[PDB]
Amino acid sequence: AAAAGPQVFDVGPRYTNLSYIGEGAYGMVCSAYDNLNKVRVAIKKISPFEHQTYCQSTLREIKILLRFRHENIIGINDIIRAPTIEQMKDVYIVQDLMETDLYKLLKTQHLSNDHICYFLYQILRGLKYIHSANVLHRDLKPSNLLLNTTCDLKICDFGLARVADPDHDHTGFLTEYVADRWYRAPEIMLNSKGYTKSIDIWSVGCILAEMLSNRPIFPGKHYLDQLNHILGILGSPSQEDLNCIINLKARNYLLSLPHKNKVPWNRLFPNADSKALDLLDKMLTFNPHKRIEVEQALAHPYLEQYYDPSDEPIAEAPFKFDMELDDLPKEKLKELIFEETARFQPG
Numbered sequence: 230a231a232a233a234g235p236q237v238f239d240v241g242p243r244y245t246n247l248s249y250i251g252e253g254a255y256g257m258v259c260s261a262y263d264n265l266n267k268v269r270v271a272i273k274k275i276s277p278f279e280h281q282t283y284c285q286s287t288l289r290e291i292k293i294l295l296r297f298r299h300e301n302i303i304g305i306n307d308i309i310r311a312p313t314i315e316q317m318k319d320v321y322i323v324q325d326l327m328e329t330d331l332y333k334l335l336k337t338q339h340l341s342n343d344h345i346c347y348f349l350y351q352i353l354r355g356l357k358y359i360h361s362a363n364v365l366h367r368d369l370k371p372s373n374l375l376l377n378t379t380c381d382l383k384i385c386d387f388g389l390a391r392v393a394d395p396d397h398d399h400t401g402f403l404t405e406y407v408a409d410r411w412y413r414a415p416e417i418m419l420n421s422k423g424y425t426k427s428i429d430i431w432s433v434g435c436i437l438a439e440m441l442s443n444r445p446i447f448p449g450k451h452y453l454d455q456l457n458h459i460l461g462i463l464g465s466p467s468q469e470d471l472n473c474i475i476n477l478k479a480r481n482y483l484l485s486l487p488h489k490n491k492v493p494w495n496r497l498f499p500n501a502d503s504k505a506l507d508l509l510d511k512m513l514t515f516n517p518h519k520r521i522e523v524e525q526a527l528a529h530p531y532l533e534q535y536y537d538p539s540d541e542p543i544a545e546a547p548f549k550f551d552m553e554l555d556d557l558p559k560e561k562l563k564e565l566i567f568e569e570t571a572r573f574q575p576g
């Protein structure tokens with residue numbers, strides 16, 4: 230067994246010359262030389278079978294990523310696992326090596342207006358496809374946008390992804406949420422479980438603002454501070470937008486807040502392309518009903534150099550039904566991961 234930071238990292242014969250490249254969610258990530266494609270690849274070791282929760286996320290991410298085929302979504306090249314359920318303790322997911330991500334890039338690098346435009350285009354092109362598959366990403370943020378040396382962008386990390394369920398999206402005030410606070414739409418704190426496509430557009434809006442300045446636009450320190458950051462820039466919601474929040478604890482909370490006026494995008498982003506700010510305004514709209522749709526954002530003037538709807542494909546095979554993974558035991562989820570990974574096996 231090849232070892233890395235002496236743990237097992239046992240990746241076939243086909244993957245040699247291993248380099249540790251950090252610790253992801255369900256285990257260790259390395260780069261490795263692929264002997265059959267003569268390219269270096271990324272390999273993620275996953276060890277989830279002890280915990281029903283880890284099995285859930287692992288299965289959901291593998292099902293989604295194996296069904297999707299899109300230039301702007303990370304693909305699975307290979308899956309290495311034992312030939313039997315009994316011997317399967319770990320799963321290794323092989324993907325294209327991406328030298329960096331937008332989080333790492335924004336920490337040190339100024340983006341040109343052309344880079345911001347091209348990166349935003351790729352994000353929306355990939356999100357069009359996800360949404361067309363009736364899937365919500367629910368955790369879009371810079372660190373989940375992988376980049377290579379020629380600025381190709383790939384969305385990753387479908388750990389929080391769900392089948393869209395706009396009809397069952399309503400919930401109480403202060404409902405607990407897992408996804409990164411700074412990219413959460415205002416409605417997640419108010420009355421939304423985040424089962425509508427408009428939650429992803431909000432996160433993309435936050436990412437565009439972060440690309441314009443190299444700083445998060447809404448870095449809230451706690452759940453309610455996230456709302457104060459949002460309303461500090463957008464201003465107090467209008468009567469119309471409030472009238473759409475029927476939940477009394479959420480409405481009366483917003484009514485308790487001192488009045489705030491909007492901060493103009495051009496004051497926050499004096500260097501920014503006016504078209505980028507128009508589109509940003511439309512993405513960071515408080516009312517999710519009035520928020521711009523992914524396809525409208527691709528059609529916005531800011532993206533007119535790239536916009537080509539014939540080359541912005543939609544999914545052949547949407548997830549029409551909810552993935553009822555929450556009440557399956559560990560053991561069934563391990564069998565389903567085994568079945569889902571079976572196409573990569575010799576034979």
